[PDB]
Scaffold this active site. Structure first.
Site, PDB file in Angstrom:
ATOM      1  N   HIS A  68      -8.947   3.703  39.620  1.00  0.00           N
ATOM      2  CA  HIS A  68      -7.820   3.127  38.890  1.00  0.00           C
ATOM      3  C   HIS A  68      -8.181   2.896  37.433  1.00  0.00           C
ATOM      4  CE1 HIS A  68      -4.346   1.106  37.659  1.00  0.00           C
ATOM      5  NE2 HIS A  68      -4.589  -0.112  38.110  1.00  0.00           N
ATOM      6  N   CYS A 101      -0.689  -0.812  34.136  1.00  0.00           N
ATOM      7  CA  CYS A 101      -0.867   0.213  35.133  1.00  0.00           C
ATOM      8  C   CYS A 101       0.166   1.326  35.193  1.00  0.00           C
ATOM      9  CB  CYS A 101      -0.930  -0.407  36.535  1.00  0.00           C
ATOM     10  SG  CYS A 101      -1.982  -1.809  36.666  1.00  0.00           S
ATOM     11  N   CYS A 142       3.003  -0.516  40.830  1.00  0.00           N
ATOM     12  CA  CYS A 142       2.955  -1.919  40.441  1.00  0.00           C
ATOM     13  C   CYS A 142       2.059  -2.074  39.215  1.00  0.00           C
ATOM     14  CB  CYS A 142       2.449  -2.791  41.588  1.00  0.00           C
ATOM     15  SG  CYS A 142       0.921  -2.227  42.359  1.00  0.00           S
TER      16      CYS A 142
END
Lengths: 400, 397, 396, 392
Positions: free
Chosen positions: B347, B89, B384
Site C-alpha cells: 500500500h 489513499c 477507503c
C-alpha cells in the site's frame, strides 16, 4: 449530457504583504477564515458540499489533506469530501475546473474551489526572485529574469508596464471605494483591504524605480512597481448546478462553460516561461468558435506587467501566431478598456494558489453586473488567462 | 455531449516494503520510472499528452509540481502539462477521474493519471499512522479495530481474505497477468511483499496488534497492509485518439462517486466512506450491487473490506445510516479481488489507485475476450481513504 | 445473608443552578437533608452504624463531608461516616455500600445518599460539561452521537420529557412527596418543575447538541439542567426496623455496576447501564418484563430511549451484550410513573438517593393497595459520567 | 455469602514529602502502583469488576480518580471504579468495599487501595479532621492521660524501623513494592535505629502541659505514597492459577466523640476491635499477627494499655472484664507506619497486603493442623477507626 455550471460568487480574505500582517497566519488559518466567510455569505452552515478542492503551493509538512481538514474545522457538514490540488499560480482556476467537471458529469450538485498560500514563512521580496518552477527551474535564472528575457525579446516599453501597474492600483482602489468587494471579501487579522494596495500611485511615482530584473542584459524595464510582491492570501468560490442554485434561492452570476490548459518548452529556451496562455487561449476560442474580441471582460493575471503586455503583443504579431502557434493569422488586439477593469495582481498581490479563486469570483460578478444593471440582447462573455510557473498556463471563458 | 472515456492500460513498478529496496528512491525517481515504463509500453515517446495528473501524499519539501517535474524528466514532449493531486489513499483514482473528466468535457484527447509514494524515513504497518496521515489521537489501525469489534467480524475471515490475496496475486504472476502491467525498478520485478508460502494456519499464529486492550482483538500484522514504496500510472484516452494511435481500449471509465464521513467524534468509522459512496453510485447508474463481474475493494485491512460487505448486508446499517429502505445485499465473493490486491502487493498511498484501475480494467477486457457470448460486463472499484473519505468507480467492457 | 430494608428517605427540593441555594454549600444542603431525615424518622440522639455519600463537584475545602455533616447534625457523634464518589451513580452506590454493610452484618442501620451544588462551578445544562466532569467531548455531544446512530427521534424525546414533568406535578398534587421532601431556603418543590409542559411547546426549541453533524434532536427541553440538591435514604436490618417500629417500604435484593469502553467510541458514553442490567437480571433469574416499576434516570430523553432500543434489537444484544436474543421492550406505562431527573433536575450525587427512596415507596404503596398477590419488584438504572452505570433491584 | 480471598498487592515506596515525589500527581503514583499490580498478576487486558480507592487531600479536578487511572492503565476499560475516602482508614475501607462486593456475589475480582501526596514535617501538625488542637497535641493529651512512657514509645518506633529493615534484607517486599522515580525502598526508613538515638531529641507535643512524651522521631513524617491490594472469589483465583494468601473474614468501623474531649481523637479502634471480636467468637489473644497502624507509638501503646486497662472496658466500653494484653512478639512483626511513613490513603493497602502475606508465610512453614489469624486495627482522624480480621 453535460449540465451547465454556475458560479454563485465567492469570498476571500484581503491579501497581505508577506512578513507583516498574516505573518503568523498558517495556511489552514487563512483558508479556514476564507471558507467561513463563504459559508456565512451564502448560509451553507451544516450543509453538505459535494466537494471542496484547493491547495497551497508552498505547502508545509503540516498540510496533509489540507482541504479536508479545513472543512472539518469549518461549519460545513462533516460529510463534505475534499482533496488537494496544486498547479502553481493556476491552482485556483484549475480547482475551479475540477469542481465544474464534477458538477457537469453529475457527481456534484454544489462545490467550493479555491486556494491559499503564504510566502511569509520563508531581499527584494518579489515573486521574480524565486526559482522558475517555484521549487525552493533548472536554468540558473529566476522567474523574474525569464520574464525579463521575454520582455526584451518582445520589446515591451517600460512606460506601458508602469501604466498598466498604476491602472490596476487605481481601478482596484475605485472598486473598493464603490464597494465592489463588500460581498467578496471578509476581513482577517484586522485587515479589511489588500495591504499592497496604494491608491495614490501613478506613472510618475513608478518611473523613478530602478529596474531589478534583466539588468545586465541591457535595457531593463522590470521593477518592483510593475512586478508583483510576495503576498499571503486565501480565496474560494462556490459553484453549483442550476437546480441546486434555484433550490437554495441563489441566482447564478455567470456560467463556466469551457477552459484549456497548456504547457511550454522553457528549459530548452524556445518559449517564454510565463508564455503558455498564448497557446491555451487560441485553441480555447477555436473550440467554442469565438474570436479574441468576442468578449466583454478580459481578466489577465498580472504576474508581471510585462507578461500581460507580452501576451497581447504576441497575439498581435503575425509572426508569433504563424510560427509559434501555427494559426495562419494573428488573433488580433483587444479593447484594453475591457482588460482587468477592476484591478488585479499588481494591486492586490499574488498568493499563488489563491489568485485563481479571486479572479473567478471577480470575473463572474462583473459579467452579471453588466447583464443586470444594463440590459438588451446578446450573450455576455469573459475570458480569464493565468500564467503559471513551470511553463504552464490556464484559460477559461464564462458566459452570462 | 459527454464522450466515452477509455482505459488503455497502465504501468507500475513493483512495490517494496519500506526501508528495504527503494529506500533511497525519491518520489520523482519512482514515478518517473513508472511513467517512462508507460511511455515504452505504448510508444508515447515525444508525444504530447493533454494532462498528467497525480501526486504523492507524504511529500518532502522538494516535491513542488511533482507531476510536471517528472514530465520534464520523462521522454514526453514538454508541451504536456501536469498538475498535482492528493487525496491520501484514493489519490490514484481521483487522478484517474480528473483526467477522465477532462476527456469527457472535450478538453483532453489523452491523459496519464496515477501516483507515487515513498515512506522510508517518514511496527512498520499502515495502521500505526494517524487518521489524518499526520498529527484523532488514534492510529488508523485502532480506528479500524473499533469498527471491527462493533461489526464483530471474525479473525478467521480476515485471515482467509489475506492469504487468498497473497496466493491469487502469486498465481497471476505465474501466468503473464502482470507482464504488461509492471516495469522493473532497483532490481525488483515482482511485488516484494508477496508471499505465496503463507497459509491461514501460519497467520493464526500472530498475536493481535490492534484493539487489544479493549479485548477480543482480531487484527494482526498478517491481515493489515504493510507500508510500501511504490508508483503507478494509467493511460486514458478518447476513442478517437485511441484508435488514431491503433490501441484498443481495455475498458471504459463510465462513472464514479466520492464520499466522506463524520468520523472524528464517532458517528461513523474512519474507513467507511465507501459504504455511503457505492450506493449513490449504483443508484445513479441503475445497477444493484450484484450487477458486476468484478469487485475490487482496497484491502487496507481485511476487516474493513469485510465491514463494507456486512454493512451493505445488514438492513440496520442500510436503513439507519445510508437511509436506504432495504439492505444492499451480499456479494458473490468469487468475483472479489480475483488476482489479489493491497493485502499482498502493499500500500503506497498514491499508487494503489493507479494499480487497481489498470488491473481491474484488463481483467474486464480479458473476460470480454474469453466470453464471446454477448453481454455487457462491469467492475466496481472501492477505495477507503485516511481522513475519513472514499472513492468508487464503475468500468465497462 | 440477611435482607435489606429501605425505610424511606428525605430530600430537599432541587433548584436550578445560580438561583435558590446559590449561596448554599454542599455541607449546608446535605446537613439540611440529613436533619429532615432525622426528624421524619426520629433518629435524634441515635447512633447509625454508617453514613456514606458525597459530592462529585466537591470544593477542595470539603474533605470528610459525611463525617463533618454527622458531626454538625443531631445524631450521636459515634455514628461513623465515609465519603464515596461515582458521578451520577454516587447516591445509589452509597446505597449499595450501606446495604452490603448490613447484609454482611457489620451494620444494623445506615443512611446513604448524595449532595451536589453546580453554582459557580451554554444554556445551563448538564450536557455542556466534560465527559468525565474534569475525548474532550461534552456529555451532550456524546449522547447525541449515540442518539443519531441509534435513530431515536425528537418526538419521542419530547413526549418523554413532557411526561416526566406532568407525572411529577401529578405526584405532587396527590401529596406523594409529603413524606420524602423537606423545605430548604423557602423552596417546597423543585424549581425546574413545569406542569404546563407538552409536546407542542417542547417541539419549538432549537436543537443544541450534535447539530453540526446533522439531524440533531436534543433541545434544552429534553435534557436535564444543572441543579443544586441533596438527598439521603435510610436503610436497616429488619430487626432494627421493628426495634424502632418502622415498616419497610421495600428490600434491596441486588445490584450491578458496569463501565464501558467510551474514550475511542467502542461504546457510547452513557451506554454502561445496558451492560449492567442484563447481568443483574441473569444473576437473579428475571427477564426485563418482570417488574412493575422501571426507574431509569433521565440524563437526556435520548439516553433513556437508547437503552430501550438497545435491548429491543438482538443485533445489539449479541454484538455488544453477548446474549442470544434481545431482552425485549417494556410496558412504558410503568416507566418513571412520577417523573425523574428531566423535571426534578440533576444534582449528580443526589439523584441516587432520590430515585432510591422514591422507588421504595412506589412499590410499597402498590403492594399496600392490592392484596392476595405475589411479590412485586422495581428496577433502577442510572447512567454515569466516566462511562459507568449502576443498576439495582428492589422487592416488596 | 462467599469467601473473600486476598491475592496480595503492589505499592509504591513511600517517599518523604517535599522530596522525591514532589512532582508526582496523585494519579501519577496510583497509576504506577496499579500498573505494578497488574504486571505482578498478569491482569493485562482483563476486566476487574471494581477498583475502589481515593486520595484524602483530593486536589482540584480529581474527579473519578480510580476510574481515570484504570483508563490510563492496561486493564480492560470495562473495569468500573469509584472513589472512597475515610482519612487514614481509606485503604482498608476500600478493601472492605471490594470484599463486600464479591462476598455478595456482585464482583468476581477487585483491586482496592489509596494514594496520597502531601508534598504540594510530622503528621501531628495537621487539623483533627485534616480540614483547634492538632492531631499530635490532641494525642499528647491522651498520652499523658494514659501515662505512656517515653522509653516504650521510642523503643517500639525503633523496633518498627529495624524490623522493616530485616524484612527488606529478607526479600519480603520484593513482590509487594515497585519502583518509581528511581526509588526502590521506603525513603524514610533508617535501619541503624537505637532506643537511645531517639531518646536524644526533644518532644514536640504536650510541651506546655508538661512531661511531654511524644517526640519528633516518634511521630510519623509526611510521606507520599500509593498502594493497592487484589482480592477475589476462590473460583476466580483458582481459574487464573493464583493462590489466596489470606481471607478477609470480617471488619468493623467505629467513631468517637472527640470534639468536646470525652474520647480521644484517635481512640475509636478501642471501641471497634472488641465488638468485631465478639461478633466472631474470639478473644483478643486468638491471633497470630497484630498489625496496628502506627501514627503515634504513643497512640498504639495507649491502645494496648487501654485493652488491658482497669475495666476501662467497663466504664468507656461497657463490658464485664478487661480485654487483656497480647504477645508483643506478634505486633507489626515487619514494621509499620512508624518506619515506612503515612500517606493517608496508601497505608491501608500496605497493612492489608502485608498481613495477608505474613499469614501465608507462617502457614507454609508450620504445616500442622491449625487456624491462623491476623487482626488489623487502624486509627483515623475525624475521630474514626477501622478494624479487620484476616484468616489463613
Amino acid at each position: 449530457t453535460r449540465r451547465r455550471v454556475a458560479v454563485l460568487g465567492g469570498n476571500r480574505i484581503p491579501f497581505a504583504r508577506s512578513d507583516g500582517a498574516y505573518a503568523d497566519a498558517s495556511n489552514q488559518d487563512m483558508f479556514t477564515a476564507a471558507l467561513s466567510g463563504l459559508v456565512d455569505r451564502f448560509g451553507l452552515a451544516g450543509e453538505r458540499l459535494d466537494m471542496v478542492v484547493g491547495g497551497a503551493v508552498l505547502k508545509h509538512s503540516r498540510d496533509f489533506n489540507l482541504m479536508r481538514e479545513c472543512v472539518l474545522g469549518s461549519e460545513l457538514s462533516p460529510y463534505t469530501p475534499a482533496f488537494d490540488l496544486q498547479q502553481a499560480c493556476g491552482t485556483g482556476l484549475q480547482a475551479a475546473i475540477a469542481a465544474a467537471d464534477g458538477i457537469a458529469a453529475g457527481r456534484y450538485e454544489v462545490a467550493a474551489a479555491g486556494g491559499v498560500d503564504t510566502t511569509s514563512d520563508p531581499r527584494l521580496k518579489l515573486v521574480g526572485t524565486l526559482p522558475a518552477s517555484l521549487g525552493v527551474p533548472r536554468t540558473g535564472l529566476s522567474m523574474g529574469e525569464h520574464a525579463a528575457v521575454t520582455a526584451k525579446q518582445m520589446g515591451i516599453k517600460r512606460v506601458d508596464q508602469d501604466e498598466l501597474a498604476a491602472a490596476s492600483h487605481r481601478n482596484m482602489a475605485d472598486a473598493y471605494d464603490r464597494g465592489f468587494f463588500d460581498d467578496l471579501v471578509s476581513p482577517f487579522l484586522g485587515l479589511y483591504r489588500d495591504d499592497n494596495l496604494r491608491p495614490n500611485s501613478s506613472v510618475e511615482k513608478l518611473a523613478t524605480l530602478r529596474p531589478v530584473f534583466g539588468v545586465k542584459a541591457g535595457d531593463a524595464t522590470m521593477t518592483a512597481g510593475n512586478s508583483t510582491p510576495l503576498t499571503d492570501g486565501a480565496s474560494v468560490a462556490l459553484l453549483a448546478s442550476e437546480q441546486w442554485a434555484e433550490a437554495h434561492s441563489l441566482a447564478p452570476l455567470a456560467y463556466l462553460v469551457d477552459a484549456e490548459t497548456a504547457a511550454v518548452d522553457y528549459v530548452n529556451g524556445n518559449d517564454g516561461l510565463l508564455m503558455a496562455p498564448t497557446y491555451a487561449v487560441p485553441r480555447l476560442l477555436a473550440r467554442n468558435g469565438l474570436s479574441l474580441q468576442d468578449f466583454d471582460f478580459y481578466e489577465i493575471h498580472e504576474a508581471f506587467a510585462s507578461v500581460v503586455l507580452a501576451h497581447l503583443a504576441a497575439w498581435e504579431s503575425e509572426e508569433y501566431c504563424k510560427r509559434r502557434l501555427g494559426l495562419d493569422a494573428a488573433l488580433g488586439s483587444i479593447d484594453r478598456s475591457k482588460l482587468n477593469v477592476n484591478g488585479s495582481s499588481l494591486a492586490a498581490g499574488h498568493p499563488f494558489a489563491a489568485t485563481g479563486g479571486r479572479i473567478l469570483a471577480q470575473t463572474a460578478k462583473q459579467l452579471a453586473e453588466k447583464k443586470a444593471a444594463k440590459k438588451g440582447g446578446g450573450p455576455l462573455r469573459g475570458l480569464i488567462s493565468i500564467c503559471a510557473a513551470g511553463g504552464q498556463g490556464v484559460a477559461a471563458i464564462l458566459e452570462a
